């Protein structure tokens, strides 16, 4: 989290997977799509 967002996101990609019961709900995924779109454009 101290790093830049380009370095923060890949570093915070892996996280403690508890079980089936929770999935945190994908804040990062839309930003990833928009970043990939910027890579295409």
């Amino acid at each position: 989290x101290x790093x830049x967002x380009x370095x923060x996101x890949x570093x915070x990609x892996x996280x403690x997977x508890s079980a089936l019961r929770k999935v945190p709900g994908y804040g990062e995924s839309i930003r990833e799509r928009f970043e990939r779109s910027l890579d295409l454009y």
Binding site: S18, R21, K22, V23, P24, G25
Partner: protein, 248 residues
């Protein structure tokens, strides 16, 4: 601002109409509930169902707890909303329009439906629609880690769910969908839990194209919504499966 001379008159006339129909509803429902049917229009109640001039079928009311989903509509044209209906919409949390909520239908619930009828829209929902609403929308006011705590969080953590709902043993928001559809053990737990709903406006509006959409939708709403003001108004029900295709 200098407001105008006309709006102040039109609001007064519209509030006069609404206070008159509300007093008619109150007197008629008092005579029904007190069971003193001597000189009134009808004894038993009715329900409209608009489907597809379009086919409008009526039923008698069944004294059975029915799951309904209510959707707040922008009220009629220039109306100050009266404090009796303001009280009910305050309880049912329907101010800040485009805001529905799931409700239980009983015969104690039914008389307020005749009251707040010019401000909301009603119907029979489906499990897929309830499912879509909950899996796509919904925030819970929540006591969190360290907050000033007017704090709302979207539905991701089923363990936050089974935390505060472990006493009823309610886990996994899919089961909250299941028990709102079911209402076998406890609906009102889920009802107070899911406390805000928000729906987008269907048309973005300001701009050349979307004004056409707005006009066509105002015409469609004029065709659909009917304002009886009779106090024996049949409860208008619409396809929320059609409606949530628009608003969600």
């Amino acid at each position: 601002k200098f407001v105008r001379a006309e709006s102040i008159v039109a609001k007064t006339l519209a509030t006069s109409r609404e206070k008159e129909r509300i007093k008619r509803v109150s007197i008629l429902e008092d005579k029904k509930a007190k069971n003193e049917t001597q000189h009134i229009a009808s004894g038993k109640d009715f329900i409209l169902k608009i489907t597809e001039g379009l086919i409008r079928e009526k039923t008698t009311y069944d004294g059975k707890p029915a799951l309904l989903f209510i959707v707040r509509v922008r009220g009629p044209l220039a109306v100050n909303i009266p404090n009796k209906a303001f009280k009910i919409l305050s309880l049912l949390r329907l101010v800040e329009t485009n805001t529905g909520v799931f409700v239980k239908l009983t015969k104690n619930v039914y008389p307020l439906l005749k009251v707040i009828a010019p401000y909301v829209v009603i119907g029979k929902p489906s499990l897929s629609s309830i499912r879509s609403l909950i899996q796509k929308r919904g925030r819970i006011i929540y006591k969190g880690e360290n907050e000033a705590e007017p704090h709302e969080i979207v539905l991701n953590d089923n363990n936050i769910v089974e935390e505060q709902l472990g006493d009823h043993g309610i886990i996994c928001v899919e089961d909250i969908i299941h028990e709102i559809a079911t209402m076998g053990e406890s609906f009102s737990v889920c009802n107070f839990f899911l406390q805000p709903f928000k729906l987008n406006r269907e048309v973005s509006g300001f701009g050349s194209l979307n004004r056409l959409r707005k006009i066509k939708q105002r015409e469609a709403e004029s065709r659909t919504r009917q304002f009886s003001n009779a106090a024996t108004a049949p409860v208008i029900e619409v396809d929320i499966d059609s409606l949530l295709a628009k608003l969600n």
